[PDB]
Scaffold this active site. Structure first.
Site, PDB file in Angstrom:
ATOM      1  N   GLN A 231       0.839  -1.293   0.138  1.00 35.59           N
ATOM      2  CA  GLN A 231      -0.270   0.052  -0.185  1.00 35.59           C
ATOM      3  C   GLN A 231       0.975   1.290  -0.176  1.00 35.59           C
ATOM      4  O   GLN A 231       0.889   2.732  -1.008  1.00 35.59           O
ATOM      5  CB  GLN A 231      -0.527   0.165   0.947  1.00 35.59           C
ATOM      6  CG  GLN A 231      -1.766   1.346   0.857  1.00 35.59           C
ATOM      7  CD  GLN A 231      -2.641   1.843   0.380  1.00 35.59           C
ATOM      8  OE1 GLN A 231      -2.997   0.809  -0.147  1.00 35.59           O
ATOM      9  NE2 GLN A 231      -3.340   2.554   0.125  1.00 35.59           N
ATOM     10  N   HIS A 233       4.270   1.028   0.122  1.00 31.51           N
ATOM     11  CA  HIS A 233       5.896   0.476  -0.140  1.00 31.51           C
ATOM     12  C   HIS A 233       6.200  -0.428   2.073  1.00 31.51           C
ATOM     13  O   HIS A 233       7.660   0.279   1.453  1.00 31.51           O
ATOM     14  CB  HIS A 233       6.959   1.592  -0.646  1.00 31.51           C
ATOM     15  CG  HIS A 233       8.069   0.781  -0.781  1.00 31.51           C
ATOM     16  ND1 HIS A 233       9.403   1.377  -1.491  1.00 31.51           N
ATOM     17  CD2 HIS A 233       8.841  -0.906  -1.042  1.00 31.51           C
ATOM     18  CE1 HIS A 233      10.732   0.805  -2.112  1.00 31.51           C
ATOM     19  NE2 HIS A 233       9.699  -0.574  -0.994  1.00 31.51           N
ATOM     20  N   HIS A 234       5.353  -0.127   2.061  1.00 30.83           N
ATOM     21  CA  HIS A 234       6.570  -0.800   3.818  1.00 30.83           C
ATOM     22  C   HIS A 234       5.987  -1.905   3.588  1.00 30.83           C
ATOM     23  O   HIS A 234       7.481  -2.723   4.090  1.00 30.83           O
ATOM     24  CB  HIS A 234       5.239  -0.494   5.013  1.00 30.83           C
ATOM     25  CG  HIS A 234       5.810  -1.277   5.973  1.00 30.83           C
ATOM     26  ND1 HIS A 234       4.903  -1.092   7.316  1.00 30.83           N
ATOM     27  CD2 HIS A 234       6.851  -1.649   6.480  1.00 30.83           C
ATOM     28  CE1 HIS A 234       5.659  -1.779   8.156  1.00 30.83           C
ATOM     29  NE2 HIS A 234       6.270  -1.611   7.916  1.00 30.83           N
TER      30      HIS A 234
END
Length: 271
Positions: A231, A233-234
């Site tokens: 969602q 880039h984590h």
């Protein structure tokens, strides 16, 4: 890479404990202020996860501006001899995103602590509540776009035979059952492998040993360019790390991620 040169990208707590005193080591902790104060791996320097993101619309998952990066790495002590060892306490999401940032700034030598703090604690290894002395002022950085996939780049690559899009969000998001943006669904042609499915809770959240076969079942193979995202880039920080760890030659993080794609006027979505 000195004392770490002989080790693969993903290392174990035992490998790190034996090298905690290495002079070239820059141990990075991306847990939380609380967790870091409660007890961190000796010598570890704290990098708040929020500091790894732009944090501003329309795409907060992008890398921080140059200024923030130069100050951050300056404080960490970024230097020519540096060898980074990264860890978090969530199975590798933030640690992987940081490794992506390491690629962004051209760092060549680094390692991921398999299972991070979780594995470290599970083996009751030494902890510290002491603060390492920050290095100094900001250092000049050479930023690279190669480790990252832009919205335009991905748009022009859709449908490509030698491209695999690793969507690391939950299945419900991938299928558009859980909508967190204007548009629900996934990037056309993308395959789904939730970041949590890559971890082994029975092994202190280390990367599952059978990971290669699992990615292969989805067409996520090294002979293809791999673009991964979540969602913001984590969670895709871990998947990005995994691809690199397995020796995949072409890997990119679509930093914009769904926060951008699901909200952009030009982006086609697929259920």
């Amino acid at each position: 890479m000195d004392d770490f040169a002989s080790l693969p990208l993903v290392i174990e707590p035992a490998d790190l404990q034996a090298r905690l005193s290495a002079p070239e080591l820059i141990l990075v902790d991306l847990t939380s202020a609380a967790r870091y104060a409660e007890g961190h791996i000796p010598g570890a320097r704290f990098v708040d996860p929020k500091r790894t993101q732009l944090g501003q619309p329309p795409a907060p998952g992008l890398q921080p501006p140059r200024e923030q990066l130069e100050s951050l790495f300056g404080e960490l002590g970024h230097r020519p001899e540096a060898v980074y060892v990264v860890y978090d306490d969530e199975g590798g999401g933030w640690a992987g995103r940081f490794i992506w940032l390491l690629d962004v700034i051209g760092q060549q030598r680094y390692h991921y602590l398999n299972g991070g703090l979780t594995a470290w604690l599970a083996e009751d290894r030494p902890l510290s509540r002491e603060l390492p002395a920050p290095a100094g002022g900001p250092v000049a950085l050479s930023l690279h776009d190669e480790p990252t996939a832009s919205r335009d780049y991905l748009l022009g690559r859709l449908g490509a035979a030698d491209l695999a899009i690793w969507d690391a969000r939950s299945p419900q998001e991938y299928r558009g059952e859980k909508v967190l943006a204007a548009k629900g669904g996934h990037i056309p042609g993308a395959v789904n492998f939730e970041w949590t499915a890559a971890m082994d809770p029975s092994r202190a959240l280390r990367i599952r040993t059978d990971i290669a076969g699992r990615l292969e079942e989805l067409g996520i193979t090294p002979d293809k360019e791999i673009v991964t995202h979540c969602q913001t880039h984590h969670r895709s920080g871990l998947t990005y790390l995994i691809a690199k760890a397995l020796g995949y030659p072409r890997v990119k993080g679509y930093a914009g991620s769904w926060g951008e794609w699901g909200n952009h006027p030009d982006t086609p979505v697929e259920l």
